[PDB]
Amino acid sequence: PPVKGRATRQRAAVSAALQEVEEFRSAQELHDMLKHKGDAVGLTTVYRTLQSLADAGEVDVLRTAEGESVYRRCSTGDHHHHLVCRACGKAVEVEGPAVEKWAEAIAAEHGYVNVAHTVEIFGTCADCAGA
Amino acid sequence: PPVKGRATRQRAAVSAALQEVEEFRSAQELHDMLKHKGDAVGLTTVYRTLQSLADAGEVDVLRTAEGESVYRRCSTGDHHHHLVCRACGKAVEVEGPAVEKWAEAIAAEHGYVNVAHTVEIFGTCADCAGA
Amino acid sequence: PPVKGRATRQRAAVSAALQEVEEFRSAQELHDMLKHKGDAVGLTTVYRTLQSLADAGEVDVLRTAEGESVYRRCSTGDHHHHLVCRACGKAVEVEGPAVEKWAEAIAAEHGYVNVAHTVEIFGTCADCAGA
Amino acid sequence: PPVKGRATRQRAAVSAALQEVEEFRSAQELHDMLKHKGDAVGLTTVYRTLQSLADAGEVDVLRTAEGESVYRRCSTGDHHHHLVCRACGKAVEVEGPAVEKWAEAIAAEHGYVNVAHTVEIFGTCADCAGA
DNA sequence: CAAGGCACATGACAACGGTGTTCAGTGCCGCGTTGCCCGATAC
DNA sequence: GTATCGGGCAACGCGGCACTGAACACCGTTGTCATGTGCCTTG
Ligand SMILES: [Zn+2]
Ligand SMILES: [Zn+2]
Ligand SMILES: [Zn+2]
Ligand SMILES: [Zn+2]
Ligand SMILES: [Zn+2]
Ligand SMILES: [Zn+2]
Ligand SMILES: [Zn+2]
Ligand SMILES: [Zn+2]
Ligand SMILES: [Zn+2]
Ligand SMILES: [Zn+2]
Ligand SMILES: [Zn+2]
Ligand SMILES: [Zn+2]
């Protein structure tokens, strides 16, 4: 995820960290990892870099029920929904043509000016269910 | 809106406000409406009664971008999703058989033990765009 | 370390950590220890409690060369001075009456109506020098 | 006022401004003085040249309560402790042998390999007390 | 019907855990500059 | 042989834009203390 602005070690390090993690992680959880790495990127810098890469669309952003937003790096450039397990903290990338068609059809039925479908699935995997 | 908690004048006043407005409203906004009525239900009372109704199932919960939870009363007890306009705060109930099937299919392919899917569409109204 | 206002678990949690620690530590450093302890006090909560305890005099505060203030609970509330080992991150309490008298005499020569005398020492122990 | 860095017009201007002031001055404030003179020396250049002079020991430094760095040029080459009035912002150099001996003695019994003793006094002068 | 018996209730505070804004302070990549450094010069 | 002269010069200056460290501010939610309101047997 190349940052749009002039490259610096801190922004490059957060970009590398997003590639290193394949799970949705909040800024506080990522900043703690970078502090343990010894990179020295500040919590405020981690917030600014995560927001810039997410605005570019390089990293996907999701919100939990608690209201804490989480950011993950996605291999697929194309838009897709996600099935996420809270216990794993990891998400699966899946895209639905039918759900997208249903959202457009619902917008057509109500004559809504624009469509911004937000389909997200939250389920726990069998491995986490086992204890 | 039947409330599981012991019956009191305060619970009835907030329940009346929920029935009065179909559109999603924040707990603070509902408290302000009760203050205007003269019911003067306490903010700590409005927050507790809204949350209690939600666990019972009388009210449905949604997340505004600002991150403030909003509560509305729904006539139908069947599973449904909401097509809501952020600009006008107007919510219309929408149901799709295909979205249920797609969510079930993603859960089945990944073999997650328990899965619950939350879906909503954000669009402006044709009347709203009209000037 | 007591806080003047009504006590809560979070105020007690930061106070317990300051009593447990025998060295000066920053708000961010103390917060990471508490997060691992599972107390779950927020960084803003760590800052508000630390500042209140320091005002009471329960915890003595020293300013580091970097400029990030570090807080520690001293053995006695009596006035004293500290010699800090940078490698240890811990200090030894030593007070000189003569230095206070010297500061008072020179302050009187200055003509100051009232004066505040502060002394700090930065060094390293013989054991810390060995590597 | 010698500068370790290669001599140039900008370095001549910052050194002259430091010579003119006999009180602790913020690096940004010295830059403000230089633009007022019309020297138009760069702020980044003012910061690096002040740091080089401080490393040389030509101009002394003090850490303020806010934590910003202030630089004062001193007539006396020999070591001393600055008594800076909080109200005036001006410092009079006073040296005490006893405080140095006390710091050395406590460090020696503690067994510290090396120690640096720093003493600062802050008070309002009788003239400043007058209003 | 009213006093008791008891509970659940309320509300006003007193708190808080996120994410966002000021800073002095410092990366950076272009510029410039200065005493040195040499090659002449025609005498 | 000296000496002043033009010009190049490469290892260094400079400045402006740009971006970063902690400490601090906001805002929807509560956790903790007290008391008035509601009902049920017992009289
Ligand atoms: Zn994705
Ligand atoms: Zn989609
Ligand atoms: Zn799982
Ligand atoms: Zn509904
Ligand atoms: Zn559904
Ligand atoms: Zn609309
Ligand atoms: Zn102490
Ligand atoms: Zn003292
Ligand atoms: Zn040591
Ligand atoms: Zn000095
Ligand atoms: Zn004064
Ligand atoms: Zn001394």
Side-chain angles (χ1 to χ4, degrees), chain D residues 20-114:
Chain D
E20 288 154 28
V21 297
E22 211 188 348
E23 54 174 329
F24 280 102
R25 201 97 173 180
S26 178
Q28 301 195 337
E29 188 58 40
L30 195 102
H31 176 255
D32 184 37
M33 171 163 46
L34 287 151
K35 71 163 69 69
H36 167 80
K37 299 331 193 191
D39 302 323
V41 190
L43 182 128
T44 318
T45 86
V46 164
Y47 266 65
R48 79 170 49 88
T49 190
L50 278 165
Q51 287 278 4
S52 90
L53 283 155
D55 187 18
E58 182 61 33
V59 181
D60 290 358
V61 308
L62 189 66
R63 291 204 73 81
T64 71
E66 60 260 33
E68 81 176 6
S69 59
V70 289
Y71 299 74
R72 183 186 182 283
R73 184 183 291 275
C74 314
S75 53
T76 296
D78 299 350
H79 159 61
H80 50 251
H81 296 293
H82 283 291
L83 281 52
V84 69
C85 170
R86 42 159 286 178
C88 292
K90 305 164 197 178
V92 180
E93 69 212 340
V94 182
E95 172 73 313
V99 307
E100 326 195 43
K101 291 156 182 179
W102 167 80
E104 178 278 325
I106 65 189
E109 65 84 0
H110 283 308
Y112 275 54
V113 173
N114 68 305

Side-chain angles (χ1 to χ4, degrees), chain C residues 85 87-88 124-125 127-128:
Chain C
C85 162
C88 278
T124 194
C125 322
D127 62 272
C128 282

Side-chain angles (χ1 to χ4, degrees), chain A residues 4-59:
Chain A
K4 182 181 178 185
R6 291 164 181 180
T8 187
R9 187 278 321 281
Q10 296 97 341
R11 301 212 282 187
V14 168
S15 289
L18 279 148
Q19 282 279 3
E20 285 166 65
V21 305
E22 288 80 23
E23 294 82 20
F24 272 99
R25 303 280 82 180
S26 183
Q28 290 194 341
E29 315 169 5
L30 195 85
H31 174 255
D32 186 40
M33 185 179 64
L34 271 284
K35 185 194 184 188
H36 292 316
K37 283 170 171 182
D39 187 59
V41 62
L43 177 66
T44 49
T45 313
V46 163
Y47 274 111
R48 294 158 188 178
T49 43
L50 281 162
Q51 177 275 318
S52 80
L53 297 171
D55 180 37
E58 290 161 313
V59 293

